[PDB]
Design a protein around this motif. Structure first.
Motif, mmCIF file in Angstrom:
data_model
loop_
_atom_site.group_PDB
_atom_site.id
_atom_site.type_symbol
_atom_site.label_atom_id
_atom_site.label_comp_id
_atom_site.label_asym_id
_atom_site.label_seq_id
_atom_site.Cartn_x
_atom_site.Cartn_y
_atom_site.Cartn_z
ATOM 1 N N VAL A 70 -2.700 -7.595 4.961
ATOM 2 C CA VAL A 70 -3.335 -6.380 5.519
ATOM 3 C C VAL A 70 -3.514 -5.311 4.427
ATOM 4 N N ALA A 71 -2.502 -5.129 3.574
ATOM 5 C CA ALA A 71 -2.601 -4.110 2.533
ATOM 6 C C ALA A 71 -3.564 -4.494 1.406
ATOM 7 N N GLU A 72 -3.360 -5.670 0.812
ATOM 8 C CA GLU A 72 -4.076 -6.018 -0.352
ATOM 9 C C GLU A 72 -4.663 -7.435 -0.464
ATOM 10 N N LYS A 86 -10.428 -9.051 2.357
ATOM 11 C CA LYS A 86 -10.721 -8.862 3.778
ATOM 12 C C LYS A 86 -12.149 -9.241 4.196
ATOM 13 N N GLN A 116 -3.009 4.694 3.796
ATOM 14 C CA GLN A 116 -4.181 4.018 4.323
ATOM 15 C C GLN A 116 -5.310 4.999 4.624
ATOM 16 N N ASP A 119 0.764 -1.236 0.000
ATOM 17 C CA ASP A 119 0.000 0.000 0.000
ATOM 18 C C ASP A 119 0.803 1.300 0.000
HETATM 19 MN MN LIG Z 1 -5.173 -1.649 1.387
#
Ligand SMILES: [Mn+2]
Ligand SMILES: [Mn+2]
Length: 178
Positions: A111-113, A116, A38, A17
């Motif tokens: 967590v970034a990509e 989720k 973020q 990210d």
């Molecule tokens: Mn993200």
DNA sequence: GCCTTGCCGGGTAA
DNA sequence: GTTCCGGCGCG
DNA sequence: CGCGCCGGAACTTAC
DNA sequence: CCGGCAAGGC
């Protein structure tokens, strides 16, 4: 140390990210930037920033953690030639990460990509080579997975984690914090 | 019956 | 996510 | 003169 | 990143 774990996770965030920017300004001014972006202000200031700050203390980096507000996202930024090469050098040695480092990095990258909703387990990236590496790591950890080109509009590949190995993935990668 | 996963378009969060 | 800008500090 | 930290924010797109 | 759809398989 335990510094390498925190570092691999932060690098996951950065690659996912943010970025590592080596800039040239008129003239001949310069800057080196370590960036994570973020949306959530709380996530950036209460979870990510203290980990970065810990790392800055450890390496005796003198730069400050900047949080900059764009309209669609918060940008965490460290202006530091030193922090820059630290991560940049760590990236170019990524293939040699130990197991604690692999797990931290995959978590950071997820967590970034990652997906989720956790209804599905997926990681999106343009960088096929990076996914092939994460793919090899997951296979050694007993998590089966596949890679294919997902979005033809932007050349984005997806790494899909087999839901057969869902429980081992959520516990070994997402739910382990070392 | 149901789970899985490749496909692909919308647009938010990078 | 990436790259401009003007600013300042420093040998 | 040359180069590196600060504080934006416009600009662009990969998730 | 999300999420509806549809095709394969147990
Ligand atoms: Mn993200
Ligand atoms: Mn990314």
């Amino acid at each position: 140390e335990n510094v390498s774990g925190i570092s691999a996770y932060l690098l996951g965030l950065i690659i996912g990210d943010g970025g590592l920017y080596k800039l040239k300004y008129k003239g001949n001014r310069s800057e080196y930037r370590v960036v994570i972006t973020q949306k959530s202000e709380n996530l950036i200031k209460q979870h990510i920033a203290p980990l970065m700050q810990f790392l800055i203390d450890e390496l005796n980096v003198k730069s400050k953690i900047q949080i900059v507000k764009g309209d669609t996202r918060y940008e965490l930024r460290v202006s530091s030639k030193k922090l820059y090469y630290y991560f940049a050098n760590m990236l170019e040695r990524i293939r040699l990460f130990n197991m604690r480092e692999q797990i931290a990095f995959i978590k950071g990258l997820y967590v970034a990509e990652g997906d989720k909703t956790l209804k599905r387990l997926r990681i999106w990236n343009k960088n096929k080579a990076l996914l092939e590496i994460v793919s090899r790591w997951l296979n050694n950890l007993g998590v089966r997975n596949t890679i294919h080109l997902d979005d033809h509009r932007h050349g984005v590949y997806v790494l899909n984690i087999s839901l057969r190995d869902r429980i081992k993935f959520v516990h070994t990668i997402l739910s382990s914090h070392l």
